[PDB]
Curated annotation (Swiss-Prot):
JQ1, a thieno-triazolo-1,4-diazepine derivative, and I-BET, a benzodiazepine derivative, have been tested on tumors with success. Treatment with GSK1210151A (I-BET151, a I-BET derivative) has strong effets on mixed lineage leukemia and promotes myeloid differentiation and leukemia stem-cell depletion. Ubiquitously expressed. There is a cross-link at residue 58 (Glycyl lysine isopeptide (Lys-Gly) (interchain with G-Cter in SUMO2)). Phosphorylation by CK2 disrupt the intramolecular binding between the bromo domain 2 and the NPS region and promotes binding between the NPS and the BID regions, leading to activate the protein and promote binding to acetylated histones. In absence of phosphorylation, BRD4 does not localize to p53/TP53 target gene promoters, phosphorylation promoting recruitment to p53/TP53 target promoters. The record marks 99 as: Acetylated histone binding. It is linked to Cornelia de Lange syndrome 6: A form of Cornelia de Lange syndrome, a clinically heterogeneous developmental disorder associated with malformations affecting multiple systems. It is characterized by facial dysmorphisms, abnormal hands and feet, growth delay, cognitive retardation, hirsutism, gastroesophageal dysfunction and cardiac, ophthalmologic and genitourinary anomalies. CDLS6 inheritance is autosomal dominant. A chromosomal aberration involving BRD4 is found in a rare, aggressive, and lethal carcinoma arising in midline organs of young people. Translocation t(15;19)(q14;p13) with NUTM1 which produces a BRD4-NUTM1 fusion protein. The NET domain mediates interaction with a number of chromatin proteins involved in transcription regulation (NSD3, JMJD6, CHD4, GLTSCR1 and ATAD5). Residues 17-123 form the Bromo domain. It is found in: Nucleus; Chromosome. This is Bromodomain-containing protein 4. Belongs to the BET family. Chromatin reader protein that recognizes and binds acetylated histones and plays a key role in transmission of epigenetic memory across cell divisions and transcription regulation. Remains associated with acetylated chromatin throughout the entire cell cycle and provides epigenetic memory for postmitotic G1 gene transcription by preserving acetylated chromatin status and maintaining high-order chromatin structure. During interphase, plays a key role in regulating the transcription of signal-inducible genes by associating with the P-TEFb complex and recruiting it to promoters. Interacts with p53/TP53; the interaction is direct. Interacts (via CTD region) with CDK9 and CCNT1, acting as an associated component of P-TEFb complex. Interacts with RELA (when acetylated at 'Lys-310'). Interacts (via NET domain) with NSD3, CHD4, BICRA and ATAD5. The interaction with BICRA bridges BRD4 to the GBAF complex. Interacts (via NET domain) with JMJD6 (via JmjC and N-terminal domains); the interaction is stronger in presence of ssRNA and recruits JMJD6 on distal enhancers. Interacts with NSD3. Interacts with NIPBL.
Length: 127
């Protein structure tokens, strides 16, 4: 019935770096997932008000979405690739916690996560 503030996508107090791995995450991983036919439920924060999900933010206390991850990558928010991978994992895990197995949203998250893992296993060695 009321949405929380969305996750931050900038913060001058957070340490940040540019790495070839973070470049890969934006140019390959995020690009591939963003354009996927099943991307759209994950491209913005869950609007629990508009979607009539009064329980969502009573269950999901660490929200994350690909729109936020996209902005964090574009804004050079991360210190390393593992911080970004964690955000993706939070997004997927939130979906499985809130929804039921076999739900359409869970099947779509599972398809995206399979592709995410295929791309992550080709993550370049840090130069
Ligand atoms: C970000 O946008 C959307 C999210 C969801 C959505 C996402 N996730 C992750 C969920 O767990 C979830 C759980 N229950 C119900 C809905 C969702 C659904 C959408 O449409 C049905 C849109 C589309 N909006 C333009 C309306």
């Amino acid at each position: 019935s009321m949405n929380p503030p969305p996750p931050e996508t900038s913060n001058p107090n957070k340490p940040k770096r540019q790495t070839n791995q973070l470049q890969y995450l934006l140019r390959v991983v995020l690009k591939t997932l963003w354009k996927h036919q099943f991307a759209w439920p994950f491209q913005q924060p869950v609007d629990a008000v508009k979607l009539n999900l009064p329980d969502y933010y009573k269950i999901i206390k660490t929200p994350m979405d690909m729109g936020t991850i996209k902005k964090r990558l574009e804004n050079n928010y991360y210190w390393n690739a593992q911080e970004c991978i964690q955000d993706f994992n939070t997004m997927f895990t939130n979906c499985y916690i809130y929804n039921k197995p076999g739900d359409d949203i869970v099947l779509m998250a599972e398809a995206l996560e399979k592709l995410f893992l295929q791309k992550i296993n080709e993550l370049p060695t840090e130069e």
